[PDB]
Design a protein around this ligand. Structure first.
Ligand code: NAD
Ligand code: NAD
Ligand code: ZN
Ligand code: ZN
Ligand code: ZN
Ligand code: ZN
Lengths: 378, 378
């Protein structure tokens, strides 16, 4: 019985940028005050993990245990902790919800700044140290989650308690991309029935935007991708027209405006490319169009447009985790999935194990691939 | 009895860019269908007139009669014209409100397509000719208004009918600057009581934004200007803290964030400088801050920022004419003025004559100067 004991389990450790992860045995310390030790059963991976693994993230610290999309079962809790207990089923969230800071109390945002000083630098608040080590040397946390491990320790403010019957190998996606996309539509844009939408980038996130728009009652849901094969998959998620920029000499924004007789009501950029972010704004209708940036740009990249774009009534916005409050609304999204009102399973194209995590990274560049879910027991 | 006749009157004609305007006798033809001939009693001027006068519009048409801020008395109307008639007091508006086009009928904007194809090239829709000439040579209209004249002829969808007791030498402001600033607050931003606002540029528009904000209930109303003398006047309009960027080594956005422990709830750019437009966005509070580009604005120049600013909850917007519908709401603004609910008189620092228009141009650059109002009878 592990309560209060150091635990030795496997984890995928990243020692150097752009090099294979190696699966080590590691020591997972027990939870201190406010902390929650989780048996992670299933973890997914996405672009966000690779951005840091590739060495391109100037916040990156090595060595570290990456991973932020997971679902598991609480092993133990540190003192103070009351919203979860041993044996609860949980999804660790990269976005806290402390319910006590300026941000949480504001009623005007899902951002919460409670633990970010510590999680941004790969440690815990309580002692500003890591809970992970190999052979007496610390390994840094990542995103407050570190889910490429059979056990992790997270802050209690980042733990969403979910329906204990929910399949852990599916609801792991509800910690990142799917709520981002759904919520970009439902919370950030607030897309009304009959709206026309354009969606730039038809990966997991974009496809979730499309499901969101479809569920909210959108009419034209126009997808844009540099890989035309992406469209056939995308039709199931609700994309009903499609444009590859490469098939046109004109800037993609002008194509979209032409196609819609003025622009779309809402656009969403789900890639991370600043040029395309500009295009997604400039394809919105004069008077009232709104563009939402979902994509995360590289360090130092800038968006631009001409101020008349905004003066003539377009609005430029962006979204962080779909504007969802993690601890409060991730359980709600689990309920909706249990009730067959949102999709999750359809975003999973590979099921592998943690042993094969390097494969899973390569699959990040297969055009046909979406999420890979990893079973941490092997 | 001047109905039906060409009128000969004084007007200030711009023959080519940058040269002093010439006060000539010109001929003003009678109104044709859908048109209204107005006896302009008072006209002001702003940057928008100077923009074309100085040649800063590579497309500007010469010779022309400029002016777009004015008030007067209808002398006659053409066929089919019902909403005004001779003797009505009116404000000609550069923003049309036809009530019948795609944009007017959307409810989601104030910007009307209707008559732009003629006004945009200095002519009237009915016969695609100008109603002005000198010795038989055509003189182009400007912005559909051409108010630098004792008489002008405009389209009926550009004419607001107002309280006949309102002083014409005051309400001539309510067709441009003052509504743009007030509406920026009340319509575009929808500022709530208790909000903290930053206002960049304390000329007429910025001062109008300040009154807007005071009237709406804002708490901190922070004015930013490069000329520290402007604060004294701004206090009466509601500005209650002041920063001059020249007094600080750090960029102004960082000064304002420090000053407000995270940023303002709303900022307004009232200058036309894309670099300050960026600063206004970047001094908004994480999570919910909104920045309004107040004013057209501007030319060629791009605005930029890092998309993280929007991902983390800031919103970028802009406004033309403060979101007001010209024909319906300029008479409402005149009502508020007559009931002492908005200021107008305080924006006027000079009363000159049409004879002295070139002096009024020079005053556009005088620091202690706000609006100049020109009496057209001299
Ligand atoms: N804001 C948030 O909170 C949040 C949360 C999760 C992920 N994200 C971001 O969303 C983005 C998408 O992640 P994903 O997992 O769907 O990625 P993905 O790699 O599965 O999909 C990206 C898609 O964009 C397409 N694409 C690439 N360049 C393009 C272009 N120039 N024009 C059109 N399409 C183009 C690719 O063909 C691919 O279909 C990433 O930036 C990620 O960082 C944001
Ligand atoms: N529909 C519309 O959006 C609309 C209507 C009317 C006017 N406008 C625009 O709004 C603007 C204002 O006209 P105005 O009549 O108030 O002009 P104004 O010249 O009276 O005022 C501009 C002010 O900005 C200040 N300023 C200049 N550079 C600055 C900087 N770098 N930092 C801080 N302050 C600075 C100047 O000192 C001055 O007080 C103009 O751009 C005009 O083009 C737009
Ligand atoms: Zn992710
Ligand atoms: Zn919080
Ligand atoms: Zn003006
Ligand atoms: Zn119209």
């Amino acid at each position: 019985a592990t309560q209060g004991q150091v635990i030795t389990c496997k984890a995928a450790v990243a020692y150097e940028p752009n090099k294979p992860l190696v699966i080590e045995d590691v020591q997972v310390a027990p939870p201190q005050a406010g902390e929650v030790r989780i048996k992670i059963l299933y973890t997914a991976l996405c672009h966000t993990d690779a951005y840091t693994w590739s060495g391109k993230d100037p916040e990156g610290l090595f060595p570290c245990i990456l991973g932020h999309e997971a679902a598991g079962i609480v092993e133990s809790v540190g003192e103070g902790v009351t919203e979860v207990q041993a044996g609860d089923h949980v999804i660790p969230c990269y976005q806290a919800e402390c319910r006590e800071c300026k941000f949480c109390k504001s009623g005007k945002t899902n951002l919460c700044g409670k633990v970010r000083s510590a999680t941004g630098v790969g440690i815990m608040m309580n002692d500003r140290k890591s809970r992970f080590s190999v052979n007496g040397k610390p390994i840094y946390h990542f995103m407050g989650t570190s889910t490429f491990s059979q056990y992790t320790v997270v802050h209690d403010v980042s733990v969403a308690k979910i329906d204990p019957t929910a399949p852990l190998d599916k609801v792991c996606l509800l910690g990142c991309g799917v709520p981002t996309g759904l919520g970009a539509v439902w919370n950030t844009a607030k897309v009304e029935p009959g709206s026309n939408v354009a969606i730039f980038g038809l990966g997991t996130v974009g496809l979730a935007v499309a499901e969101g728009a479809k569920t909210a009652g959108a009419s034209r849901i126009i997808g844009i991708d540099i890989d035309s094969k992406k469209y056939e998959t995308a039709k199931k998620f609700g994309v009903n027209e499609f444009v590859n920029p490469k098939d046109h000499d004109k800037p993609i924004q002008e194509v979209i405006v032409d196609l819609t007789d003025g622009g779309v009501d809402y656009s969403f950029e789900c890639i991370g490319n600043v040029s395309v972010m500009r295009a997604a704004l400039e394809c919105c209708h004069k008077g009232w169009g709104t563009s939402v940036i979902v994509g995360v740009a590289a360090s130092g990249q800038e968006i631009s447009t001409r101020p008349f774009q905004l003066v003539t009534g377009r609005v430029w916005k962006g979204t962080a985790f779909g504007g969802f409050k993690s601890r409060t609304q991730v359980p709600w999204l689990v309920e909706k999935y249990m009730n067959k009102e949102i999709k999750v399973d359809e975003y999973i194209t590979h099921n592998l194990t943690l042993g094969e995590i390097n494969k899973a990274f390569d699959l990040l560049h297969e055009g046909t691939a979406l999420r890979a879910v990893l079973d941490t027991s092997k």
